[PDB]
Amino acid sequence: ATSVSWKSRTKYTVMPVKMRKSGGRNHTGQIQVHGIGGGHKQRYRMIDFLRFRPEHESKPGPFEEKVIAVRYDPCRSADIALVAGGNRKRWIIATENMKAGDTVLNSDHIGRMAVAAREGDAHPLGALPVGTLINNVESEPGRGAQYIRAAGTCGVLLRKVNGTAIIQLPSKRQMQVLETCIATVGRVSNVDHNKRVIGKAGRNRWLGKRPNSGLWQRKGGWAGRKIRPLPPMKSYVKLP
Amino acid sequence: KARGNEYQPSNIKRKHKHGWVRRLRTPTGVQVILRRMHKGRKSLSH
Amino acid sequence: GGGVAHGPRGPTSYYYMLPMKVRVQGLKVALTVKLAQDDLHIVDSLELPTADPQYLIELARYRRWGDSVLLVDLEHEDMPQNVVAATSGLKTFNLVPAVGLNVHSMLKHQTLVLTLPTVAFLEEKLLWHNSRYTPLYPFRLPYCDFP
Amino acid sequence: AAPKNRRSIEVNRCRRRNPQKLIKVKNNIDVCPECGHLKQKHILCGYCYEKVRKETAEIRRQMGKQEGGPFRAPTTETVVLYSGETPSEQDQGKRIIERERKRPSWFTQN
RNA sequence: ACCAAAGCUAGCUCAACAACAAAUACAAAAAUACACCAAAAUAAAAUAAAACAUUCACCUAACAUUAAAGUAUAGGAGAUAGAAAUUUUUAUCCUGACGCUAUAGAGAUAGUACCGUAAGGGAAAGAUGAAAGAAUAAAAGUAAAAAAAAGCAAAGAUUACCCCUUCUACCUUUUGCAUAAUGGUUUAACCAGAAAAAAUCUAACAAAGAGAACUUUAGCUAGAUACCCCGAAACCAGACGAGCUACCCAUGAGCAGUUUAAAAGAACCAACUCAUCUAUGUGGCAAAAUAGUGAGAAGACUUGUAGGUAGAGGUGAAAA
RNA sequence: ACAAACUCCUAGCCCAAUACCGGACUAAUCUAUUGAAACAUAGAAGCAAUAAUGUUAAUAUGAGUAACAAGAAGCCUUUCUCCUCGCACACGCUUACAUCAGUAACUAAUAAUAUACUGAUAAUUAACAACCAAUAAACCAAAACAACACUAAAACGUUUAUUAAUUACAUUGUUAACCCAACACAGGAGUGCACCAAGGAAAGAUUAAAAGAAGUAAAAGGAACUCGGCAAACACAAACCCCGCCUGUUUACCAAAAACAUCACCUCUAGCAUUACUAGUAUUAGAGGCAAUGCCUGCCCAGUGACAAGUUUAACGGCCGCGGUACUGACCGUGCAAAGGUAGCAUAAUCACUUGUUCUCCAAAUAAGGACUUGUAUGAAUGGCCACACGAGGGUUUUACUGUCUCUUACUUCCAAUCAGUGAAAUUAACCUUCCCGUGAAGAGGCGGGAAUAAAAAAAUAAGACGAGAAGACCCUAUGGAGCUUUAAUUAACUAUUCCAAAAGUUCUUAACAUGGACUAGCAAUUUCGGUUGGGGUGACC
């Protein structure tokens, strides 16, 4: 008949908020995506993906923030860091070696001499050196981070043309982005997430994954090893 | 195992599925009431 | 409690129209039978001396008219008073305009009685069908001789 | 196994009117010299055994009253008395039950 | 002699004509607090075509009635479907009954008992008299009245019941049935042949006949003669179902002891959960049980309350 | 001589029959006139049941048969004799609860008497329980006796500020022996404390037949039983195989398995935002395959796919001849292929031959294990091969144990049979209901030829009544159905694709909607699957 979604919250709280999971069903209560449900019960913890976010609307300048703690999160594969400055606390995605009692710099400023950045550093794409390693890359400036959030992944800055940077995503497709987009410099935390062994079937039901069907199917024409010439560059710059 | 005990009485489920309000919320429910009045039943709705 | 397999169905009408000349010659034959069995009596006038029904019954007895009697008058408006009353008070006697003569009633009463202008009427209407053409349209419409 | 045919009433009259299924006539019935009711020769008289039984019940009630509780029962022999009677020396030293009814004719003094 | 049997009424058919007052959509019958309201998309198929694909009247609308006419046309040019132009129609009054009597006629004494979670299904019955402010002995089945070698149960007969003598139950179905083919315990009440083109028969009037339109080289007009009953699996539309079970989403609740550094899809073994194997049971105690015996027993564990997904679908550690 | 429906004779109303087709009469209704007590001419129809596993009602038979229940004695509620699902709440039921009274007959599957039948009258009393505020702001920090930790990351609110009618007594649930299973059902039922302090009776009375059910004991022997050591045991232990790796999950009601899942390993398809996936972002997420681990995974892009000619097998799928030569064939020739089956393993849970050969195993083995092994129809992610650990899986041996068995026996209890209550079921043309051998629609209680034979009960046994149950699930036939699959034949909607118009603008473009006509696919529709035949299929024919 009906349903109401769990995602109503208007305000940003760092205190973990109770979330209601729905295995596989859309709002009409039918299975849409198979094999989801019965996980261990989890709270959700809000992330601020816009890393350059002036706290008081009046003063425009750059941020200096401090790392209070680094915690596990059930919701995402990467590890999360609690970062505070002024009157504000936020959960941001932690870079690989970030430790408690740390200092982080956030600036939207682009200088011509660029900068050498630590991992907890967030700069505009065009202000970084040509060789650097990035994650939490934003698509259109002011939109927040979207790409390269997962556990232990990294992008790399390639070249710069006409005030527009080119980055390489983890799948190695190349992405064209305006210089003013902010990015974080480093690797995402917990790089060993890939080597973890799931011991029994139990761990699967703990992660909230149901067994597959018992229906047997011939592999179709779709199956085999296909070798594709790499998909062309994605361009988020629009023409005048 | 052994069957025929399928109906496990509950007063809340009874009123929620077959009760007067549930009928009146949907058009076809309304026609259930209507047909049942045309046949003149002592009890229209659970 | 089931439905009836064949049974009577719907309102049913029995309707069939005998050809005219058959109905006419039927009427003729009825008159003929009446006459040749002595059970027809031609009357003139029809004015009654009084409105008392006892007069009519005794008049049946003294003339030995048999048990039941039908009387036929030329018109419905032209019926004399005493007769209308006296006859309208009896079952076995019966009174009818000439427009309403028919075979079934002629056979239902042992004795038929005609007014003289009534004979002049019937004889004409019935005799008219030997000499007629087959109808062109309904006879109610205009014809040369026939009204 | 299911019966192959309905049986006729003839066959049934044969079977269930057999001299064996008929109730036999009991020939040992007599009358009891006292109350003149009927009794069978080898069995006690019903009507006599009744008045005996009633009196036993009542004497057991009164001797239930002479006893204080459920487990308490006399070590002496008992002797029952009726209106107007006084204990003999043979019967003294024994528990005595006193009763209103004058001693019934069929119950002797001994 | 029991059990039974009989009434004539309740009412129906078909057709003309034209007790408030309060309480209620909270989980209806609960006076009273912040909202929301409200919504719409061709009918399909069964079936005809001896199959089945184009096609298949009636099923929505009003238009009636007599004709034009089953004609023009439309059709796997098959099955079948089917107009119009143009023509006809006198008033009301005048209501009843070759309609049913309690297995009929309404399903009805009732949409009630009862059966269904629910949409939905859906019964049975009454009988004296003016007065109860008077108390026929006829169906089957039995009783009065067990049964005496032998044989489709009778028949020919006899002084005589048997005893003699002569005879393959009845329907249906088949080439052929005593068949050991089907059907039926028995009684009562219900329970199955409808059409008028051509024809024949009987009459009317006749080169014409019909109470309008038509047909006519003895024809026309009228009457009378005619063609069953009960059964699938299906298919299509719209409702109602997730109180069982499948899987989820909320919110609760259990798991003693013993062993081990251990809550480790580890041991042992209760509660609790399953259902291995055998015997009982088979119109059962039970529309799946009982007795023994078994597997698991801090987990992909069992379990309570409450939501959700609905048949062209759902759900599925696939057993269609 | 005796023998017919034939033919005489004496009289007549004067010569058989299924499907179909002609005729004459009439039963019972109603309507026209008569008729008067049953009517006779017409006209009309719901117009005539010995048969549908017909419908309803009622009666039998099976049958007084199957089956049902109340521990003893007394002074009448008091002792005894035995067994243990007990008291609350939640849900759910609705007066079934309480007192007095009545029970002939209704309920109890019988009685007695009454928590369950009938009448009258009463009754559960709120402090427990239900009902019972909003909006701002601070607060990263698990429950686990919680010190502190573990991974799977954990249900639950205080306090500050702003307003909140302010006022005895609101309203509602309160019984029970109870609910869901047609029943006053040996069954299904959540939670808290209990093992009795609380609850309850396994036998209506006998008798001690058979056959059945449950239990106990057994001389000598100890699997000789049998498909199998199934069941049962004064036993409870060892070993070897095949298949799955493992705990788990499934055909509620004939299959818990070798089937499914699964850790792990690999293929594909995706570069991104408000309701799924996901408040995620390629170490991620969806379609799948195959099943841990170890050693491995051979050669094949010609077909069909699928992709965006070419590329792909951890896609669908394939992986050879013919003869010559040292009994054999390393070699040789020639042919065809897209490649020519390799590493292994092997008579196998692997077409047949087939009880292959041989060794071990037993007194003897078509079983089991080990080898040889062209398996001409094994074989490597539709996975090939070894191995722990685990199976209520299948097989084999041994120990031990025993009534499985040689080869049965004794005794108890439920049934049982007799007495007393109450009282069903399928079934049934009618039966006055024998045996033999013939016959016969081809297997007779009924026919033919012989036999045998007072009449009825109760108890047994199952050879027959083609016994009783289900209009045979096999087979075939309907121009009957349905489910499933594709290269069957006709093809939409939809979801995507690509294109042309349209629409806006440019002087050739498409941001998101979005219509017309195409195309290419997926998912998907509608309908059929000819006939003869010494049954059908295959073969053959029309």
Ligand SMILES: [Mg+2]
């Ligand atoms: Mg997740």
Ligand SMILES: [Mg+2]
């Ligand atoms: Mg998988």
Ligand SMILES: [Mg+2]
């Ligand atoms: Mg699979």
Ligand SMILES: [Mg+2]
């Ligand atoms: Mg039911």
Ligand SMILES: [Mg+2]
């Ligand atoms: Mg009727």
Ligand SMILES: [Mg+2]
């Ligand atoms: Mg057809």
Ligand SMILES: [Mg+2]
């Ligand atoms: Mg037909």
Ligand SMILES: [Mg+2]
């Ligand atoms: Mg067909």
Ligand SMILES: [Mg+2]
């Ligand atoms: Mg149609």
Ligand SMILES: [Mg+2]
């Ligand atoms: Mg009726």
Ligand SMILES: [Mg+2]
């Ligand atoms: Mg109900």
Ligand SMILES: [Mg+2]
């Ligand atoms: Mg009789």
Ligand SMILES: [Mg+2]
């Ligand atoms: Mg005889």
Ligand SMILES: [Mg+2]
């Ligand atoms: Mg014969």
Ligand SMILES: [Mg+2]
């Ligand atoms: Mg028959």
Ligand SMILES: [Mg+2]
């Ligand atoms: Mg035959």
